[PDB]
Structure formats: structure tokens, C-alpha cells
From a paper:
RBR E3 ubiquitin ligases like HOIL-1 catalyse ubiquitination in a two-step mechanism where ubiquitin is first transferred from the E2 active site Cys to the E3 active site Cys before being transferred to the substrate. Here, we show that HOIL-1 is unable to ubiquitinate lysine but can efficiently ubiquitinate serine and a variety of model and physiologically relevant di- and monosaccharides in vitro. We identify a critical catalytic histidine residue, His510, in the flexible catalytic site of HOIL-1 that enables this O-linked ubiquitination and prohibits ubiquitin discharge onto lysine sidechains.
To investigate the importance of His510 for HOIL-1 catalytic activity, we determined the structure of the HOIL-1 RING2 catalytic domain with the active site C460A mutation in the presence of ubiquitin. The ubiquitin Ile44 patch interacts with the HOIL-1 helix, with the ubiquitin C terminus pointing into the HOIL-1 active site. The ubiquitin therefore mimics the donor ubiquitin as observed in the E2-ubiquitin/HOIL-1 transthiolation complex. First, ubiquitin binding alters the angle between the RING2 domain and its N-terminal helix by 30–40°. Notably, the conformational changes are not restricted to the N-terminal helix, but ubiquitin binding also rearranges the HOIL-1 active site. The biggest differences are observed in the protein backbone around the active site Cys460 residue (mutated to Ala in the structure), in the active site loop between Gln455 and Asp461, and in the sidechain orientations of Trp462 and His510. In the ubiquitin-bound structure, Gln455-Lys457 form an extended β-sheet with the ubiquitin C terminus, whereas the same region in the unbound HOIL-1 RING2 adopts a less structured conformation. The ubiquitin C terminus also leads to a different rotamer of the Trp462 sidechain, where Trp462 is flipped towards the active site Cys460, leading to rearrangement of the His510 sidechain away from the active site.
Author numbering:
A (entry chain A): 424 to 510
B (entry chain C): 1 to 76
C (entry chain B): 431 to 510
The structure:
């Protein structure tokens, strides 16, 4: 019913708040990371996601485009103090 | 029986299942329609992850119910 | 063979053209086919019309690949 729908909405809200899930910034499906480094590639749209900043790794030109995205290491500055490798 | 799976924000897909289908069986129908490998799929109904071994019945998933699809992906 | 095509169609190695309904066989490797009879553009990876009724460019129907940067299917490499 609507109870089942609200229980899922609450589960998703909690996952988002705890950093266990996010929405793909391009196609908006909910993604979780299982192991590995600070980045994932969305299976639906192939966008590279910076997990440690919970956002796109790159701008609209794709890999290599630092006009958007987390800009890790541009001018030598990591995108987040805990980043070990967001690609 | 018809069920609905939420995918992208605001988008759903429809599936044709039976009360007795297993979760692994439903993830295989999602694969054939949407191209997502079963091991990347996590299904949520009524606030709980569904276990590959149970069936729709054990979770009281009835006609026109709505599941939410989540992608579980490996870090790089 | 007539009996072979019957099998390919059920096993997804062939489909019916979304415009003219004639049997179209898989082109290995390719995510797009042009129907040899009616010349309509077919998205093989989603098994449907590539475009809407206005022809190439008409995203009012078809698979809508790359609209808003979203591929039509996770496995699509290029359905034109
Ligand atoms: Cl990207
Ligand atoms: Zn995506
Ligand atoms: Zn980053
Ligand atoms: Zn980084
Ligand atoms: Zn045709
Ligand atoms: Zn396509
Ligand atoms: Zn495509």
C-alpha cells in the first residue's frame, strides 16, 4: 500500500543521509558502492561518479573535462581530504 | 501478475511475474528488459532488501505493488 | 530456412521490423539496422524503432538514445 511506499522512502532517505547511496548525477538512478576506491561508473549512463564528494567526477565533456565535477588535483588540490583515488 | 519497478527518478518499468517467482528470477527479468546484470541489482519493497532466495509471496508482494531498484556497483 | 527463422524469432536472433513487420535478422556487432524493405532505422539493442514517425532525428518516439546524455540501453555502443 502507501505504507510500503513510505517505508521505502524512509529507507532511501536514511541511506542517502548516511552516505551509503546517492543518485547518479546524470540519470538519477540510486547507486550504492560496494568496496574499492572513491569512484564508481554508472551502469546505466556510464557517468563517472566521485563517491567521496557524492557528485560527478567530470564536467559535461566526460573524462578529462575539469570545467565541472570534483576537479580532484587541479592545481594540485585533492577534491576531499579523505580521497585516496576518485579516478 | 503485474508489478512495477522504480528505476530513474520518476520512471518505472512493468514486469510480468507470479506470486511464486523467486527474487533471483525477478532480477533476471529486469536484466532481459533493462540490461542490468543481476549481481548489480538490489531490490527494495516496504523498506527491506529482498533476499535472492525468497519469493514474492514471502514478502507479500501483490498485484500492482511497486519495488524500487538500486544499483550496487564496485568501486574502481 | 523457413523453420530456422521461426526459431531465431523466439530466441531473439531476429525481430519484426517495427514499421513493416517483416522478419529482420540480427546484424552481429551492430546496435542499429536499416530495414532492407521499408528502410526504416531499427534500434537492435532495445528491439524497437530508432525514431518516431518523423524519421531520423524525431525523438517523439523511438529509443531516444543520448537524449539528456542517457544511452538507450546500458549495452548500447552506438545505435546511430
Ligand atoms: Cl564521466
Ligand atoms: Zn547514471
Ligand atoms: Zn573526486
Ligand atoms: Zn579525489
Ligand atoms: Zn521494415
Ligand atoms: Zn537505441
Ligand atoms: Zn543507443
Amino acid at each position: 500500500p502507501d505504507v510500503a511506499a513510505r517505508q521505502t522512502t524512509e529507507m532511501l532517505k536514511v541511506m542517502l543521509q548516511q552516505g551509503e547511496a546517492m543518485r547518479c548525477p546524470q540519470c538519477q538512478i540510486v547507486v550504492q558502492k560496494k568496496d574499492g576506491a572513491d569512484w564508481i561508473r554508472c551502469t546505466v549512463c556510464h557517468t563517472e561518479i566521485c563517491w567521496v564528494t557524492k557528485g560527478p567526477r567530470w564536467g559535461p565533456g566526460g573524462p578529462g573535462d575539469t570545467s565541472g565535477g570534483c576537479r580532484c588535483r587541479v592545481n594540485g588540490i585533492p577534491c576531499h581530504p579523505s580521497c585516496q583515488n576518485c579516478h | 501478475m503485474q508489478i512495477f519497478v522504480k528505476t530513474l527518478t520518476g520512471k518505472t518499468i512493468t514486469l510480468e511475474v507470479e506470486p511464486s517467482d523467486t527474487i533471483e528470477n525477478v532480477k533476471a527479468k529486469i536484466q532481459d528488459k533493462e540490461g542490468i546484470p543481476p549481481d548489480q541489482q538490489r531490490l527494495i519493497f516496504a523498506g527491506k532488501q529482498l533476499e535472492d532466495g525468497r519469493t514474492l509471496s514471502d514478502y507479500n508482494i501483490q498485484k500492482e505493488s511497486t519495488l524500487h531498484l538500486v544499483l550496487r556497483l564496485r568501486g574502481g
